[PDB]
Amino acid sequence: AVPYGRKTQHTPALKEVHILWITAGLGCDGDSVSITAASQPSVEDVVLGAIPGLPKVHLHNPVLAYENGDEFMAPFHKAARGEIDNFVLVLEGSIPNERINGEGYWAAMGTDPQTHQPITIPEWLDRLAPKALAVVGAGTCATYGGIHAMEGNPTGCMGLADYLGWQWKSRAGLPIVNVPGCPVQPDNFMETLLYLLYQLAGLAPMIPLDEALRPKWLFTRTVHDGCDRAGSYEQAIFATEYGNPNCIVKLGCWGPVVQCNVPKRGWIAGVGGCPNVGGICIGCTMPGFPDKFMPFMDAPPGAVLSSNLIKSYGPLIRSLRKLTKDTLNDEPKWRHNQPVLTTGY
Amino acid sequence: AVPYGRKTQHTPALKEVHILWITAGLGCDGDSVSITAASQPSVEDVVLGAIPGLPKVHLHNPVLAYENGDEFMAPFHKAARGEIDNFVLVLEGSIPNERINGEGYWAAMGTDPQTHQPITIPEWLDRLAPKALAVVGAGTCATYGGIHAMEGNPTGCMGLADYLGWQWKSRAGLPIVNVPGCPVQPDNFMETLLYLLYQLAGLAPMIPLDEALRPKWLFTRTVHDGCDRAGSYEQAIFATEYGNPNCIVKLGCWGPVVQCNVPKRGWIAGVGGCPNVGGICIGCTMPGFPDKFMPFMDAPPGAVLSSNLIKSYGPLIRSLRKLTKDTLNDEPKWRHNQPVLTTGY
Amino acid sequence: VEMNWDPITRIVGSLGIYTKIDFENRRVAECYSTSSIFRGYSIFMKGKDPRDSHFITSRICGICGDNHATCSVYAQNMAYGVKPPPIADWIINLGEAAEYMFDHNIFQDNLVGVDFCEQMVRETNPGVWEKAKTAEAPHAAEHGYRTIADIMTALNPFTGEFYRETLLVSRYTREMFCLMEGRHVHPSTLYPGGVGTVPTIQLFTDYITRLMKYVEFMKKVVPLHDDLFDFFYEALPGYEEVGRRRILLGCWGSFQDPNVCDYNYRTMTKWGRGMFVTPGVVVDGELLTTDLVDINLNIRILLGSSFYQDWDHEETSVKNDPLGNAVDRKHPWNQTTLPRPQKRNFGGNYTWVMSPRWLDKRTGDHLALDTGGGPIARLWATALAGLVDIGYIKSTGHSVKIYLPRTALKPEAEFEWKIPMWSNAIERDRARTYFQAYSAAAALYFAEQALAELHAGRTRTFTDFKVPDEAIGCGFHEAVRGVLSHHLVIRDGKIANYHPYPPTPWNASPRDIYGTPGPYEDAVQNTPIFEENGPEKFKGIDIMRAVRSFDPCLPCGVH
Ligand code: NFU
Ligand code: SF4
Ligand code: SF4
Ligand code: SF4
Ligand code: SF4
Ligand code: SF4
Ligand code: SF4
Questions:
Q1: Residue B99: which of A329, A335, A339 has the nearest Cβ?
Q2: Domain check: are B116 and B81 in the same one?
Q3: Do residues B59 and B47 lie in contact, with contact meaning Cβ atoms separated by under 8 Å?
Q4: Is the residue at B77 inside a domain?
Q5: Does C219 reach chain B within 8 Å, measured CB to CB?
Q6: Same domain for A110 and A56
Q7: Within a domain: residue A331?
Q8: Within 13 A of C225's CA, how many CA atoms are on the CB side?
Q9: From CA B34, how far away is CA B80, in angstroms rounded?
Q10: N vs C: which end of chain B shows fewer Cβ within 10 Å?
């Protein structure tokens, strides 16, 4: 009864995988909420294993989980002991500085019966991190510290690299995987997770990351490289007020120097965006975010130099486009309802 | 039993509307097949009145029609007998010159109930157009003559405005409504069609159109002003072969002088397009199409000029941005797990 | 018996519920709620440019951030003395309406729904499952589910037909949202003085097209949930008692009228009224205020049970409002957050969540006003006002009339939400579904207004402004989970003080100095135990159904 063609069905190198999702870092749960917007692939696509041949995925995420309280945490505590040999660690939110304390906590999950003492995020990390197949950073907070690692913050928090080391490799040789963004672009994360499910199954090579440990195929090109308002930039036409359809670099957009794919990719099903729809890029996917971008609605100094640049040839190269567009908005002479044919036949 | 909300529902100026869709032009039915792909609004959305307060829609289109043959042509014949008043005439395909014949025909749809001869496209237009509430051209063939009004074509065909006259008006005051594109972009047409359904219900002003009888809000801006490769254009980075992610003007793209929203808008549900995904723009929405654009894969003459010029400041501004991006890939110094906080708090 | 669950899942943020429950009598003696995350927005916001507020405050939460951005942009509008073009606030309303439609739908049928699904009911009340199979749903004609037991199975996570569907519904409602505000949850096109969204006939076409699909979906979902909730009222007579409290409801208004709103503190009384969700404190079955200035001045943040040192000896910044009124010290405008990290102890100090209360001028009481969800608080206030006349939404006095016109496959529908007589867990959840129809209804009206502005040609979307060297500002806006306020202070052209107070902060708060319980506590205390299990395997679903009714959101709660 075993149908010919099942021979195309090859068992994954890793039969199953556990995804331990810590949302109790310093942050909102925006990256968890965001990924439920994905379609390429969707989050139910991944759990129900819509794409065959990949490891069976077990998703342990507080926001969606069926288990509750102490039973939800049970898989977390088990892995800590070394009982689990197939879990990837996902952090969402930044890592608090607990050394500046103290007899308290900035962030925590799992009150523990060991002493009736809440575990801190730093304890969880170097408890699970060195036993994991891979550690994933979900959101600019967990990757680089983000908005909460702002100048003047009380917690003195940081990203996963700050805490573990930028050269830190997992027990399976996988460097820290950083998927930045605030929040993470839905498809971006699901593309990266899917890539990891492929790599672990044996069907793909080591995930190509960059120096900041970002997925190359998502974060190499800059925002400006994919912005459709870039025409009006070349032609020296810059928006005077928000809402205008032209380039908004003088209005706050850091797009020319930020590594993000949103304008090119869209936010949800091609719909959303930032500067391509009149929202200035505030550089939310960068390590320097947000301090190296504020005040947001001010022009980037670099833009000021390049904006003020005199492109003399501008208005006449803008002329032949006009002149050429006019010859192209008129039909050839042989299109008429006259008694004789004049096409050339 | 009438609820208060009913006061919000208003009766459309025109209670019902017929759309007579003559596909028997020198066309290929691609514009018809195309609008089935739309979703904003969908064809079945219009047919079932998803949006309240609009004229009841009876769509008479051969590709979808339940009715067959003589029953399908019934409402057509009845409208040429002046026995139908609220119908909109849509044409798809080029209008042929039947004056260089002769016995026979280039194109025919119905059959003459008396002479029992095929009815030519010009004959259908004379009987229907002056009675129609509005005359809509669907596709570049029906608007400007399109690919079939090419140099050397045996039928000597043309577009609506050519046959009926550029300042032609219906008996409701509406000018010829040209919707260019080869094929028409799915949501482009349904939006035009939807606008007309709003106007007839007296819920919106006359359809704003340009001197070529194109909807303004759809065909004002050029391909270029909405191309997410414009970025690589401004930074003078042009592809030299075809699978290349940067500007392709040197390879055939007419985007800078072509009026179309495709790259900005996507093809279907934001997914496709032309130069934005690596397919040169061949100006298929322009009166000059296709003759003024051939050969397609040769770079347009006006292109050679533009590309050379901006090779000047290209290098500097590129390195300015690369250096700035470097600074942005570095976190602020106050992110670390040291014993003492250094954030400012 | 000491039964506690921490962290609580299927909510946003890390929450912990510790309790003392009397099994022998089926009662909950005490209760104590606690968060575990502190980020300190009020702290690092100080000294920053005011123009950055809405971008930063949006990150307060990953599910409702657009509400803070909106609420923040409201306040800057006040401070900078600027009124954005009329079309810009229609756009912002259309965006926020989609935010309601998205959030309540994802939360109702994917987070709180799991509490009602087969798998849970067959782990909590194996008997009720047996009962459920033979109960035919009163509205199977509208939602196609024959029995309540079928509906329940349709909610099993990932396998349930309706579970999987609402995920889809949360995507195109977010698409809608993104058409108006750029991206979700943190907006990109929102600014003080207007928006960056380009108004075209396409923009409103793509929104209306998706809206109509959400409307028809609600014709199915309203009856679908009434039947499931009416069931528990019939299945377990008295269950109404679970998660109930005195009618202590807050509603600080929602969608705004550019015809009237100029964003001045003085005229704030007036255009406070004409908001398409009437603001007001309801207490209890009775309605006190039509005025936000009235309700604004009476807000006090207490600290009986929180990890802060209190700002006794910290300098005030605002003594009077822009209209001369007196301003309190424990009011957010004059608040100073001193974070005090310390060991947990439910005797006195056990939560990062402060204890906001309200002041009744009539009685001198500082009651723990709640939102309930808070689509429940919202609907209650508007019904009484009898002030909103939108057609799609109409206020009588005894109720509010929600009308949804004919879609492609269904005819008209009207949903009259009558005052529930009770403020319980189920009636909350019942309210959440009804407000989704409210949002969809309201959104239909805003789309009209917007198109007029567009057809008129008035398409400017931004009005220029200047940042004052000395100013104050208040933002009032109903978030998804209820009342949301943003109090801003500007000194030396910089942010001197900024405190956002979302709905959760109230609901999750502990008891004030006066010792009045935290809005969960009182609701989770008065909560009976209709459960069918004893402590040993007992998972305590009845308390969870109570906390989740409030629609908790701990990032908003501590910020
Ligand atoms: N809705 C909502 Fe939030 Ni995560 C709350 N509570 C707030 O403004
Ligand atoms: S990166 Fe942004 S969305 Fe994600 S946890 Fe941080 S503030 Fe939230
Ligand atoms: S709006 Fe931004 S990304 Fe777009 S072309 Fe301008 S500076 Fe570049
Ligand atoms: S602000 Fe910039 S980096 Fe952030 S999602 Fe938008 S385009 Fe990307
Ligand atoms: S405009 Fe193009 S798609 Fe339409 S009939 Fe002509 S050749 Fe076919
Ligand atoms: S590929 Fe074409 S439309 Fe695109 S930026 Fe280049 S010349 Fe312009
Ligand atoms: S070839 Fe040009 S005009 Fe035609 S669909 Fe493509 S972008 Fe539009």
A1: A339
A2: yes
A3: yes
A4: yes
A5: no
A6: yes
A7: no
A8: 25
A9: 28
A10: N
Tell me the residue range of the domain where B230 lies.
221-299
Question: Quick check: CB of B147 below 6 Å from ligand 6?
Answer: no
Tokens of B130: 């002056």
- Note whether residue A332 is domain-resident: no
Residue A233 and residue A91 in one domain: no
Angle between helices A74-81 and A121-128 (to 10 degrees): 50
The sign one gets for the Cα dihedral C500, C506, C508, C509 is positive
Please give the helix or strand (H or E) that residue C73 lies within, else none. Answer: helix C65-79
The residues facing A22 across adjacent strands are A91
SS (H, E, C) chain B: CCCHHHHHCCCCCCCEEEEEEECCCECCCHHHHHHCCCCCCCHHHHHCCCCCCCCEEEEECCCCCCCCCHHHHHHHHHHHCCCCCCEEEEECCEECCCCCCCCCCCCEEEECCCCCCEEEHHHHHHHHHHHCCEEEEECHHHHHCHHHHCCCCCCCCECHHHHHCCCCECCCCCECEEECCCCCCHHHHHHHHHHHHHHHCCCCCCCCECCCCCEHHHHCCECHHHCCCHHHHHCCCECCCCCCCCECHHHCCCHHHCECCHHHHCCCCCCCCCHHHCCCCCCCCCCCCCHHHCCCCCCCHHHHHHHHHCCCCHHHHHHHHHHHHHHHCCCCCCCCCCCCCCCCC
Binding site membership of A274 for ligand 4 (Cβ less than 6 Å): yes
Q: Which experimental approach was used here?
A: X-ray
- Regarding beta strands C470-479 and C482-491, do their DSSP bridges make them parallel or antiparallel, or are they unpaired? antiparallel
B21 with B164, same domain: the answer is yes
Q: What's the rounded Cα separation, in Å, for the pair C370 and C518?
A: 9
3-state SS, C437-454, equals HHHHHHHHHHHHHHHHHH
Q: What would the two tokens of residue B248 be?
A: 């392709």
Q: Where are the beta strands (DSSP E) in C492-558?
A: 494-501
d(CA B176, CA B143): 9
Q: Is B321 contained in some domain?
A: no
H helices of chain A, in order, are 30-35, 43-47, 69-72, 74-81, 121-128, 140-144, 160-164, 186-201, 216-219, 230-234, 262-265, 301-307, 314-328
Same domain for B281 and B205:
no
- Can you tell me the distance from the alpha carbon of C276 to that of C391, in angstroms, rounded to the nearest whole number? 11
Residue ID of nearest Cα to ligand 5 atom 5: B27
Question: Using the 8-state DSSP alphabet, how is residue C16 labeled?
Answer: E
> How many Cβ atoms from other residues are within 10 Å of residue C315's Cβ?
7
Q: What is the distance in A from the centroid of ligand 2 to the CA of A31? A: 6
The enclosing domain of A274 has a CATH number of: 4.10.480.10
Q: Indicate which ligand has the atom closest to the C-alpha of B325.
A: 4
CA C9/CA C13 separation, integer angstroms = 9
- Give the range of the structural domain holding residue C539, as residue numbers without chain letter: 1-559
What distances in angstroms separate CA C249 from CA C158, C357, C438, one per listed residue?
A: 35, 11, 18
Q: How far, in Å, are B49, B56, B57 from residue C212 at the CA level?
A: 10, 17, 17
Q: Is the CB of B92 under 6 A from ligand 5?
A: yes
Q: Per the annotation, does A157 bind a ligand?
A: no
Residues near A169 by Cβ (< 8 Å), separated by ≥ 6? A175
Phi, then psi, of C195 in degrees rounded to 5: -125, 170
